[PDB]
């Protein structure tokens, strides 16, 4: 096994998956790694059973038709493991806890969302379509670029929204478009 969290790539008490290389802090994986089972199998080797289980499923799809569907344990799956593609990238500490917004010039957004929320939020089994989660992550971005305006600070939220959108694409088999 590796001997950095593939998510932080930081050492530290790491859990190691059985069936690949990769460790993990115990709440940098998501869902955050389980008590006992022996084997353990990390997220990464899960969405790929599901994929060879169904080659098919890599056929492409619209986004329109993913959004609608339920929340099954596939789906749920397939979520958080976008969840933590996105965490994976350092720049994700702007965007993991609660924000606050006093900025000369600008208004807080209504309704404020962060990472560590939407995480919660999927383990404790709120959203009932891909629809719920795509829109609370699409969220942050949004919220972000408003706030800052003509900050350069902006792009972080340009940047960390690409990292979601390509790997939404990637793991829900969107069809490739120009
Ligand atoms: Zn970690
Ligand atoms: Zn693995
Ligand atoms: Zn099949």
Request: proline share 4%; net charge neutral; hydrophobic share 30%.
């Amino acid at each position: 096994n590796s001997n950095i969290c593939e998510v932080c790539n930081k050492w530290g008490r790491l859990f190691c998956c059985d069936t690949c290389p990769r460790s993990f802090h115990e709440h940098c994986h998501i869902p955050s790694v389980e008590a006992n089972k022996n084997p353990w199998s990390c997220i990464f080797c899960r969405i790929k059973t599901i994929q060879e289980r169904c080659p098919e499923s890599q056929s492409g799809h619209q986004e329109s038709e993913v959004l609608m569907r339920q929340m099954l344990p596939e789906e749920q799956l397939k979520c958080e493991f976008l969840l933590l593609k996105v965490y994976c990238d350092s720049k994700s500490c702007f965007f993991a806890s609660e924000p606050y917004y006093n900025r000369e010039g600008s208004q807080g957004p209504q309704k404020p969302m962060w990472l560590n929320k939407v995480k919660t939020s999927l383990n404790e089994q709120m959203y009932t379509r891909v629809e719920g989660f795509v829109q609370d992550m699409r969220l942050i971005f949004h919220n972000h670029k408003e706030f800052y305006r003509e900050d350069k600070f902006t792009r972080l939220g340009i940047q960390v929204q690409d990292i979601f959108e390509k790997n939404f694409r990637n793991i829900f088999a969107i069809q490739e478009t120009s």
